[PDB]
Symmetry: D2
Subunit: 211 residues, 4 copies
């Protein structure tokens, strides 16, 4: 802004598509048909949980004027031990997790959240997504360090073959280790802005995955 009051449009613009490799959960499942159980991984924030409520509360509580809350151990303790009660599970994640359970895959969560003394996020995820004990693995809190992709080594260590995530670093962590990185759309009401350019590495992007 400012911008024209009545900008109008045209049918070239209305029909215009970005060249993105869109996929569905069913297409992913089909692409894996006949493949034995393997390790797969999920990002948490804006991938399986709309957790902006806790991040928003955290900023207001711990650093209303800056971004310091993200490096505040007190914030992470709150975030990892109860504030996910307000996090809303994503339907795309329900469908993916169900599919990987059907396959007998081992399911990992690899998050940029900082590790804390205790955490109840693993419980929240297993409960909300109805993940059986055998498929479930305790959440890996990889942390966040500018200049380093903290997730890549975890994907290698756990032999993760597919990694789902909303951020560029989720996709490149997969690329770093030769895994299949698949993009989930970050919701437009997320407080984590700007939204990433889903498909910017030529990766598969799941349709309708903002909710």
């Amino acid at each position: 802004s400012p911008s024209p009051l009545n900008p109008g449009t045209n049918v070239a613009r209305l029909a215009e598509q970005a060249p993105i490799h869109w996929v569905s959960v069913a297409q992913i499942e089909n692409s894996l048909a006949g493949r034995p159980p393997m390790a797969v991984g999920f990002d948490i924030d804006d991938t399986v949980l709309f957790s902006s409520p806790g991040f928003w509360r955290g900023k207001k509580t711990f650093s209303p004027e800056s971004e310091d809350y993200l490096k505040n151990p007190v914030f992470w303790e709150k975030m990892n031990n109860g504030w996910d009660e307000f996090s809303i599970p994503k339907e795309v994640a329900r469908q993916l997790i169900d599919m990987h359970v059907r396959r007998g895959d081992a399911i990992f969560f690899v998050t940029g959240r900082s590790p804390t003394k205790t955490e109840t996020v693993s419980k929240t995820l297993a409960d909300n997504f109805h993940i059986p004990a055998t498929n479930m693995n305790p959440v890996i809190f990889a942390g966040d360090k500018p200049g380093q992709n903290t997730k890549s080594q975890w994907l290698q260590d756990k032999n993760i073959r597919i990694f789902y995530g909303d951020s560029d670093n989720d996709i490149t962590a997969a690329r770093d280790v030769g895994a299949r990185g698949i993009r989930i759309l970050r919701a437009s009401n997320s407080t984590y802005k700007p939204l990433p350019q889903a498909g910017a590495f030529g990766e598969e992007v799941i349709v309708n995955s903002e909710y």
Copy 2:
């Protein structure tokens, strides 16, 4: 061009809508319910006929290196006396013309095409759109003169209350005389480029009207 190989997208962009007053034929009909017969008008090119085939042929035949064909009387003779055999009627126009016939409206066509000694466009339109004799009026060839909207005076003269068209000058001709100007989308494969910004005057734009 050039532009990024993998530009990606995000869900804000995917869901983004231009602020346009979109309408359907049914909504227009409803808005006129109970109103007695009146005069209404249609633009021809890219409004009721995809006539690019004749314009394309005309440019190649009469001015392959310039835009002079548009002021060439020989071109207009060909265009108005047979080349509309290759023009493709628009479905939106079939629906609008049917609706105005239901209403008992007088139907006019007001085109920027130049007048010629003879014309068979009136026949083409009445035949293709199944317009009864009573509703049909001979095409008004208003011509094109830079700096002047040649259509406005015709809308006034014929007491035209609604004017349908694809070009900015169709909408402003209606505005000039206090008529209701309603926009039809120009097809993206039209040779008349650039496409106009439908809705740029805050006018109603008919959905799906490119075909």
Copy 3:
């Protein structure tokens, strides 16, 4: 109907628009130019606040297998006295409220939330949207009793001239009293499902208003 693995698409579908009266905040502002200060009203949930985090926590806490939480005063006491710390303010609301405050309009909030003994929602709204105390009015907790219109009487009582809301009942409540009902899009990750058909009464719908 079969839902194919590879459904494909076509350019008619890609370009297809629903016939909706889309508007922008700037267009609304323009439509009010020169009009003196008036009373305007807002729905709360999915109109100005993404409050699904608290409603989600409420469902899980108070009625995991039913909708009984929505009639449980213990839930409402939590929801109205602190759980909005986890609600995410909507950008469309920031823009509308700023615009109306700039106009000198009186700002009302009329919600279907159940009334409670105390409420901190009024403070949350005034603080987050930077609403001066003069323009601000205490939230009107109209309640929600299906088969009953509980907002219209309040719109009439406060002479509210424009009412913004996401639900069908918000629009018809406005229409029933002769107010201008303007629709805001409910986010697709709201837990209040199904999503309403914005524009279902021919009302104005604000573009990009899901966030």
Copy 4:
């Protein structure tokens, strides 16, 4: 189902994407980097030429109440010896042909149009798309006999490695011989209806290829 006067919409629908493998010409070019000159093939109608003007004239002239014109040699003689002067070349085809000529690829056209005693279509294509005589090959008129695949044998004969087309049979013809079938969108104002479901076999579809 009732088709409401005011159907409305919701943001799930607004953001909804079909799971299609969209590609750009630049991405196709990138995928071929370093690969030596090869034979590539194009369908004609609605792939490189918007030829509906002639097919429309043909239907009206030769079989206004049936599809018999499509099997009438008198129609084909007209269609293949001058009516393409009214066909509108597609921009997507200009870009693809330029790209393949730049690569040093051999260019073939394999059409389901019926063969005629003479044809000027090869010249029309070479002239309009600026195809050097070396890269150019005379159009292969494979014909169209429903229940029969008439293009696959030609793709094999000419060792065509990539085949571009708008119809389902174009894609499956390519797949049947192990060639890369790439879909172009049929324009919504084509008279060949219904429009195909581009992407219905999981094939690549070129973005914005309706014009």
